[PDB]
Amino acid sequence: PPGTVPRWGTRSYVRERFFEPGLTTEEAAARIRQTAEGMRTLRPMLETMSWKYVLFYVRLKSKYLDLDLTTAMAGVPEPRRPEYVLVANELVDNMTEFDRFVRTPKVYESYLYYEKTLKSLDDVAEFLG
Template structure:
């Protein structure tokens, strides 16, 4: 009986050991993560990076070439209207113009303000205000530069009209910002008259 009991204990221990081995094996196989190797060799990776750098350098060179080739062209003022399509260019990238170019831009600004009536009629206040402020940003500078083209005898009248123009545009900005419809139209008409008077003196 003792021998039978020992035999059964040995059998039970063997079964438990086998069960633990199976459980341990299944546990390790469950968390096994296969190693994935890159399919691109280091040489191919270096070649790919060189290709990207070369492409960027070529694109930059072409852009610079186009920019430099455009410097021999006439001023942009002679090629385009100073309207809504050149907002960013006018505000940030245009250098000071010559007196003759400043006179031409004042005339273009006068035309643009006349064409602004449609935006005002539609009460597109945001666009009207944006347009006015953009023109104000460089108009004062243009008025000063353009004065050098006038003879000494006309400069006094020019200064008076230029100051009226600046004041009327400031009031137009104020009433469009509110917005007040009647006052906006009143100062819009005053602005048109002032800039037409300035253009007539140039």
């Protein structure tokens, strides 16, 4: 049980994505799978109404999973991959609505999507690997 690989955090979101240009295929396959076990930790923070992280985390993980899903999906099995693109629509509209139901804080719809937002993300990364 040794240490792990940081794998390109390291920046202040103006160094990353603006000044340290680099993103290789199968490397976005790390971010995609990471925001799955990542975004599955807000459940306690949706239980109690912490309406101030359920926005920042969603914005960041989205703006990260709104470029990888366009790079990673170019590098899945290209012979047969319309479904790997017929999933990004769902995995980026469920979240685009999640971001709506947190802006004017609701509970029923917010949590009804905080399950149907992760239930999909386990399938976008599924077609990857």
